[PDB]
Structure formats: structure tokens, C-alpha cells
Ligand binder design. Structure first.
Ligand SMILES: *[C@@H]1O[C@H](CO)[C@@H](O[C@@H]2O[C@H](CO)[C@@H](O)[C@H](O)[C@H]2NC(C)=O)[C@H](O)[C@H]1NC(C)=O
Ligand SMILES: *[C@@H]1O[C@H](CO)[C@@H](O[C@@H]2O[C@H](CO)[C@@H](O)[C@H](O)[C@H]2NC(C)=O)[C@H](O)[C@H]1NC(C)=O
Ligand SMILES: *[C@@H]1O[C@H](CO)[C@@H](O[C@@H]2O[C@H](CO)[C@@H](O)[C@H](O)[C@H]2NC(C)=O)[C@H](O)[C@H]1NC(C)=O
Ligand SMILES: *[C@@H]1O[C@H](CO)[C@@H](O)[C@H](O)[C@H]1NC(C)=O
Lengths: 43, 53, 132
């Protein structure tokens, strides 16, 4: 339940991760804090 | 040199220095691998068929 | 008690001989006691353990009467409660490997008496020089 005045301190981040095989990559998600990720400059 | 009129009790099972030789040969086996080549790029999909036979 | 013989007479050669006969070869075990990318640390700590043990033994000698005699006599008498056996049945009967076990319990009682007698003899010598 997002409150627009406050901020969520967790971001649900999905990304490509390399698998144990050097051919195939997978898509995996994780949870990070606001203090560990920064937005690079829609999407 | 030979020792006359002496008697010591031995035990190969509670002996030391088989532990030392085991540890040293394991570690010395490991230390001849640090200059060598890791097969990181070879973990890859292998399309395998039978040998020509 | 030494004679003419051509054999090598080496380190721990008279370990099984009686202790009146291994005493005639004590400079051999005294001689062969000191000189002998990661493994240099193991060799190096073995060498410093060797010189540390040699220094500890020479320090135990040096705070007693003899510092380089290798056979020395002192002024504490043999308490007969320690070994209660004759003089003839040690120097002609037993070995140092067998005499080590028989006074291992009474060891460290003797060493304090050795230091005590040497400190008392040092202060008696200092007073005897001082009265002159
Ligand atoms: C998702 O997160 C974004 C931030 O990346 C939120 O966008 C702003 O959030 C702040 C505080 O959370 C609000 O004060 C702003 O008004 C939001 N911007 C807009 C344009 O509304 C966003 O609200 C979050 N929630 C959703 C459902 O997208
Ligand atoms: C994971 O990898 C996939 C594929 O490499 C990425 O999906 C592409 O995203 C771009 C930008 O939106 C599209 O133009 C491509 O068409 C997409 N390709 C496919 C196969 O879907 C994806 O962005 C990566 N990241 C995540 C979080 O999934
Ligand atoms: C292993 O498989 C390879 C194919 O990947 C074989 O190589 C081919 O052999 C044919 C038959 O002589 C030649 O015409 C091709 O030019 C070869 N290709 C390459 C890239 O060398 C190979 O002979 C097989 N070996 C065994 C032992 O089965
Ligand atoms: C030293 O103590 C042990 C254990 O009490 C004993 O058996 C042994 O006889 C003692 N040593 C001597 C020389 O009596």
C-alpha cells in the first residue's frame, strides 16, 4: 500500500543474470534498498 | 647408525607425520595449480553426437 | 674410561649403554644438537625452535655453577628419598633412558634447590670478597 507522502524503502528490481552456462542468461528479480541503488538517466 | 640394547614401543596407527605428509601432499598438490588455466569459458552448451565408429 | 677404537662413535650411539659408559661420550650429543615459496616459513620456525631450545638449556646451566663445563658438580646433597638405591647399581646397571623415568617425578624439585644453592653461593662469594 503505497503512501504518496512517504516513500517505500524497498525496490523490486529485475535484471538479466548470467547463468552457469556462458550461452544462456536468465531473468531474475531481487529486493534492494533505496540507499543501495541510484537511478541512471518513461522507463 | 644402530643403537644397541634399546627397546622402544611403536604404533603406526596413533603415529604422527602421516598426518603431516597427507596435509603437505594435499597442499602441495594445490600449489601447483595457481599458475594454471581455469576453464571458465568452457562451461558452455556442448552439441554432442556419437564418435565416427 | 676411554680406549682405542676406530668405529665412528656417533650421535645417540651409547643410548643403550650404561650411564657410566655413555658419560664418556657426551660431546657428541652436545655437538649434534644445534646445527642439525611458503616452506621457508616452516623451515625458519623449525630453526628458531632449535636455537630457542638450545638457549633455554644453556640458560638453565648458566644460572647454576657450570656454564661451559659439560660435567659439573654442586653443593646440594642427594636426598635418598628421591631414588633410595645404591651408587653401584646406577653407573654400572641402568641407562639414561631408564634413569629418566625413575626421577621424572622428583624433577623440578631438584632444579629449585640447584638455583637456591647457586644464589646462596653467589651471595656468600660476594660477602667474602666484601669483607676483604
Ligand atoms: C512507485 O515509485 C515512484 C517513484 O519512483 C512513485 O512516484 C512518485 O512517488 C512519490 C513518493 O512515493 C510521490 O510523492 C510522487 O507523487 C510520485 N510521482 C507521481 C508522478 O505520482 C510512485 O508513486 C510509486 N507508485 C506507483 C504505483 O507507481
Ligand atoms: C533481460 O534481457 C531481455 C532480453 O535480452 C531484455 O528484453 C529486451 O528489452 C528491450 C528493451 O525494452 C527490447 O527492445 C527487447 O525486445 C527485449 N528483448 C526480449 C527478448 O524481450 C530485458 O530488458 C532484460 N531485463 C529484464 C529486467 O528483463
Ligand atoms: C567429430 O565431428 C566433426 C564435426 O563437428 C568431424 O569433422 C568433420 O568431418 C568430416 C568428415 O571427414 C569433414 O568432411 C569435415 O570437414 C569435418 N569438419 C571439421 C570442422 O573438422 C570429425 O571428423 C568428427 N571426429 C570424430 C573422431 O568423430
Ligand atoms: C611419581 O608419581 C607417580 C604417580 O603418582 C608414581 O606412580 C611414581 O612412583 C612417582 N615417582 C616415584 C619415583 O616414586
Amino acid at each position: 500500500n503505497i503512501t504518496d507522502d512517504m516513500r517505500g524503502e524497498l525496490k523490486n528490481c529485475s535484471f538479466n543474470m548470467t547463468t552457469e552456462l556462458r550461452d544462456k542468461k536468465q531473468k531474475v528479480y531481487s529486493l534492494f534498498y533505496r540507499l543501495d541503488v541510484v537511478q541512471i538517466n518513461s522507463n | 647408525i644402530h643403537l644397541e640394547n634399546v627397546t622402544e614401543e611403536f604404533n603406526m596407527w596413533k603415529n604422527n607425520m602421516v598426518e603431516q605428509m597427507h596435509t603437505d601432499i594435499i597442499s602441495l598438490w594445490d600449489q601447483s595449480l595457481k599458475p594454471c588455466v581455469k576453464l571458465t569459458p568452457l562451461c558452455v552448451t556442448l552439441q554432442c553426437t556419437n564418435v565416427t565408429n | 674410561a676411554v680406549g682405542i677404537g676406530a668405529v665412528f662413535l656417533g650421535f645417540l650411539g651409547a643410548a643403550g649403554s650404561t650411564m657410566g659408559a655413555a658419560s664418556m661420550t657426551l660431546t657428541v650429543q652436545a655437538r649434534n644438537l644445534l646445527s642439525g615459496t611458503v616452506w621457508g616459513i616452516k623451515q625458519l620456525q623449525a630453526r628458531v625452535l632449535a636455537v630457542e631450545r638450545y638457549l633455554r638449556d644453556q640458560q638453565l646451566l648458566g644460572i647454576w655453577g657450570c656454564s661451559g663445563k659439560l660435567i659439573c658438580c654442586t653443593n646440594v646433597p642427594w636426598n635418598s628419598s628421591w631414588s633410595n638405591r645404591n651408587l653401584s647399581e646406577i653407573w654400572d646397571n641402568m641407562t639414561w633412558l631408564q634413569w629418566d623415568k625413575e626421577i621424572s617425578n622428583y624433577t623440578q624439585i631438584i632444579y629449585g634447590l640447584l638455583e637456591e644453592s647457586q644464589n646462596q653461593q653467589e651471595k656468600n662469594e660476594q660477602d667474602l670478597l666484601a669483607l676483604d
